[PDB]
Design a protein around this ligand. Structure first.
Ligand SMILES: [Zn+2]
Ligand SMILES: [Zn+2]
Ligand SMILES: [Zn+2]
Ligand SMILES: [Zn+2]
Lengths: 287, 286
């Protein structure tokens, strides 16, 4: 119950000393993720001063840890708030690291080449340009993109060798700080980055070596924000949260990150709606 | 007086750096708006890069703002002209949003039939030009505009039934056809299935509750690329008030004429002969 989660919420805030106010006003509502992101911030600066991230900003990491915490704390209280998904993430069973050279966009269909990979619905659109039916996926160098996909998968395996399911799925944020209506993409941008130093040079550390690229998520349309987190670090956020919970509680509750299902809802927007400009006048026109 | 507004303008022109050529040529005369439009595009680019138009020619947008500023400059300087209206617009009290399923043309006559047209079109020279291939499609647009306006003016004691409509395009600023811009309903595709419990911005909720908006175009799409949606035209006016209220604090008086149906708006079906210039003193040779 809400009260049940409230107790669990209280504790974490006391232990990791959350500002006297935030805890006093935290009532467990969907928009209340500052105190949660705060308990994580201290626990990090206290128990993990040596966390080196890769293509991730500290704000994004502490932010994400908050979401996954809210998830657990909610899963623990058996609370579901309509029109709200705690994680701000979904699991995309991508099929990019399967057929050599082939990638498949968010639609679950192949990507039409233009070596560049474009979502098939941008057929008319000139390469890196999107239609209102697009999912907003594009890759300049298609090979790199796959290397990044192979990497996250390699990493995922190293961390979970005896998994019965999961190595094909992709943990990915569905909303950046912007959408937490606007034109352009509707989900954080997925961009592959390369690790030149790895090229030369612990199974998970070898993942980056064997596949010198990394999936990085930024803002939807870099409205734009400084959101940035690489996939593997995003996994480590989910993980660190699990441990933080396990340090404070005997059993870890089920937290189901929704599996990604395509929807028009995530379609690239090309047309805007009017937003009124501000006027101090009471009446519209003079008579 | 002329000196005052002439000074208020060169002040606004220098500030937003309009080409010295236009700066000189300007004189607060009836159809001088290029310079003003310029002051407007610059001001927009400088302090409003995030502006976004829905079915509106960018050019059409600064043109309208130019007109509204000209209106202001003129009133401010108290300089009127025998046959000119700076705004180039009128306040049509449309009754198309009041009675469910009812639309009415400029004449003030219900529109008759799927499609709905002017009563004198069951175009005839006694028509106003108004026609709608789909009734609902059309009314959905008229509803939205009322919604947007109510939002932007919640305490408005009067004006939600009116419509800021333009009277001329870059064609008539006689000639055959519709004697004013063409009003054509355009549906808002993405809004159709959007949760109306999104955020606290009501004006957007208007487009959400009524996914389709009125777009004004050329009198006869000689024809021009005049394109501007109802809400953007209202914003043209609003933003000019902003621009002005910044530099002069108190905004002057400026009444946009109210629409009164009259023959000069009837569909023109027959031309009136125009004499071709002849460089002769006498027409014939005997
Ligand atoms: Zn796609
Ligand atoms: Zn963003
Ligand atoms: Zn009529
Ligand atoms: Zn025209």
């Amino acid at each position: 119950a809400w009260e049940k989660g409230m107790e669990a919420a209280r504790a974490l805030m006391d232990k990791y000393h959350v500002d006297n106010d935030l805890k006093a006003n935290f009532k467990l509502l969907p928009d209340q993720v500052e105190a949660l992101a705060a308990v994580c911030k201290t626990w990090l600066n206290e128990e993990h001063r040596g966390l080196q991230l890769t293509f991730t900003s500290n704000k994004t990491f502490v932010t994400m840890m908050g979401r996954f915490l809210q998830a657990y704390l909610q899963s623990f209280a058996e609370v579901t708030y309509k029109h709200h998904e705690p994680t701000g993430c979904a699991l995309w069973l991508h099929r990019c690291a399967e057929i050599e050279g082939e990638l498949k966009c968010l639609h679950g269909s192949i990507m039409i080449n233009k070596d560049a990979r474009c979502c098939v619905h941008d057929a008319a659109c000139p390469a890196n340009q999107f239609s209102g039916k697009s999912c907003g996926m594009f890759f300049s160098e298609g090979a790199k993109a796959q290397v990044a996909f192979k990497q996250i998968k390699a990493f995922m395996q190293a961390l979970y060798p005896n998994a019965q399911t999961g190595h094909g799925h992709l943990l990915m944020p569905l909303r950046c700080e912007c959408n937490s209506p606007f034109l352009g993409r509707q989900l954080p941008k997925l961009t592959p980055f390369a690790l030149s130093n790895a090229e030369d040079l612990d199974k998970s550390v070898l993942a980056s070596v064997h596949h010198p690229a990394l999936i990085v998520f930024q803002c939807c349309n870099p409205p734009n924000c400084d959101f940035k987190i690489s996939a593997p670090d995003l996994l480590n956020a989910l993980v660190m949260v699990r441990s933080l919970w396990s340090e404070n509680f005997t059993e870890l509750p089920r937290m189901v990150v929704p599996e990604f299902k395509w929807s028009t809802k995530h379609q690239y927007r090309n047309v805007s709606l009017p937003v009124a400009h501000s006027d101090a006048r009471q009446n519209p026109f003079d008579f």
